[PDB]
Amino acid sequence: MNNIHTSTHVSTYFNEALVDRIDTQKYLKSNGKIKKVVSDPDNHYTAAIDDSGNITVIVHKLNRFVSIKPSSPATHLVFIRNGNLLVAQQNGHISQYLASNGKLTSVIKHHNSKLLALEYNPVTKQILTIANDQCTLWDAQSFNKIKTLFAKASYFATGSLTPNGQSLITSFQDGNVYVWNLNNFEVTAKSEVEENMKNQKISVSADSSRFVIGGSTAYLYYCDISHSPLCISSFALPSGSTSVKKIKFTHGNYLGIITDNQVFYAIDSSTNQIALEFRLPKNKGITDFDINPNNLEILIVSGNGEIFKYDLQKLFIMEMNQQQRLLERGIESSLVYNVLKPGNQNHSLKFESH
Amino acid sequence: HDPALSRSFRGHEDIITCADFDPKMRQVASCSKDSIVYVWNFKPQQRPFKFVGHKGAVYCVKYSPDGETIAS
Amino acid sequence: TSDHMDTVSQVLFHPDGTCLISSSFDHKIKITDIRSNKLIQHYNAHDAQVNSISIHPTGYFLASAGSDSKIKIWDLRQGRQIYTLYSNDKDI
Helix, strand or coil: CCCCCCCCCCHHHHCCCCCCCCCHHHCCCCCCCEEEEECCCCCCCEEEEECCCCEEEEECCCCEEEECCCCCCEEEEEECCCCEEEEEECCCCEEEEECCCCEEEEEECCCCCCCCEEEEECCCCEEEEEECCEEEEEECCCCCCCEEECCCCCCEEEEECCCCCCCEEEEECCCCEEEEECCCCEEEECCCCCCCCCCCCEEECCCCCEEEECECCCEEEEEECCCCCCEEEEEECCCCCCCEEEEEECCCCEEEEEECCCCEEEEECCCCEEEEEECCCCCCCEEEEEEECCCCEEEEEECCCCEEEEEHHHHHHHHCCCHHHHCCCCCCHHHHCCECCCCCCCCCCCECCC | CCCCCCCCCCCCCCCEEEEEEECCCCEEEEEECCCEEEEEECCCCCCCEEEECCCCCCCCCEECCCCCCEEC | CCCCCCCCCCCECCCCCCCEEECCCCCEEEEECCCCCCEEEEEECCCCCCEEEEECCCCCEEEEEECCCCCEEEECCCCEEEEECCCCCCCC
16 A cells, blocks of 8 residues: 556557567576667667676567677667667677677777767767767767767766767756767857756757757756757656656657656657656566657567567557547647646756757 | 769778769769779779779879869 | 868869858858958858868859768858758768
8 A cells, every 4th residue: 555556558558459479488588587678770670688688689570589698788779771789788888799690790998887878870870879977979880989078077967969960969967958069079059057967868859959858857858949048948747757767759759758757758849748658567667668760669678577569659549549539529638748838947958059 | 853872882992082073974083091092984884993092091083074084 | 261260171163263162170161252352151061070062063052061971052042051961971
């Protein structure tokens, strides 16, 4: 007495209308369970990390997998169009394998960090690593470096590149979010903010007209370059959110969200409201996600041990329908979604950028 | 009305700095950052020429308007 | 400094050999004439380590290139940037 269970907002959604199955009997061989999902920008080679840490690339048409022998887990995976896998390992190094073989080719090291969050820009050939106090920008072929962004004191929390264009946004613990001339090491855009946030991350759109910030406090910030400041506003989150662990952009005006209340959300940034809400049984739980943008093919790792097995594009049907039936009555989306209202300057991450 | 990347010069080793053209429409000259320039044509069954010189970088290659001499 | 910061890149010309075009490491193209060394506009360029350029033979289009791998094309008959190109990995 008392908390929430079970799986009605997650396994019931995820497995609603599948055409194949991750037959987890073939994957969960550890004495233990799957804990994290890391994934392919080229979408298909998504991968599982279990409590051993061996990366299993699940190939969702074969119901076969690439068993990567080293047990070192990834923070995230990057793949390129030519068949290579760059693994940002939790060991402080980024390790590239032929994706096609799981065969080690090279390691990027310079970082001293627990986290090496990655993002790959397929139109720049550039991969960025967010780690400790620095951003390392490098040629995606991964055998050299371009720049090491850094600071005298504000510690680094995050940043990312823009996949269908190019601009680099980074932020500090200060919440200060700023934009770099990633190829001149110039801060061209600068902010000073009120909301300090530990372990914040910046989600960067492929066409980076839009940006999002998460972190240890229960807030979400949203940028829109068509307006000044780029970060125009901030807002508080649906009741029960305590912090935000992970935020990532998708094709439509949308982001996946993981909070530290372990509820996952899909947010529509055109309004800054939540479209989808995801919940699992008590620990057990939901631990991480992988969204593949064309259909939002999804690899979810749950603490419940289940490896999913769903497309957000298909789950949206339930909040397309439902909502559209209610639209025949005239239900308001700002309530359905819970729009998060722009607040004061007192806790904003407002940022001018050009 | 398309930027039209057509078909690239497959095989350029690495490290590319320039190009110019033979207005026969066309033969393409190009150059690397180390010891090499290339000249090739379409009718893709045609094979490129690999020229050696410019032991350091070559920054620019140019054709006369008749597409003849290629300065580098 | 006609304002440039560092090692100047390719200088191009109006089809008649006038109104020369230049940029450098600084992210801007200046289009300026000869003797009458006056500017007609700031053709803001890429935020590149270094920029690069050629102009369509008619003198209508500034092909803005550079050390970064975004590419964009300008229409000089309008003075607008036409748009930033898809580019798709090209540090031209």
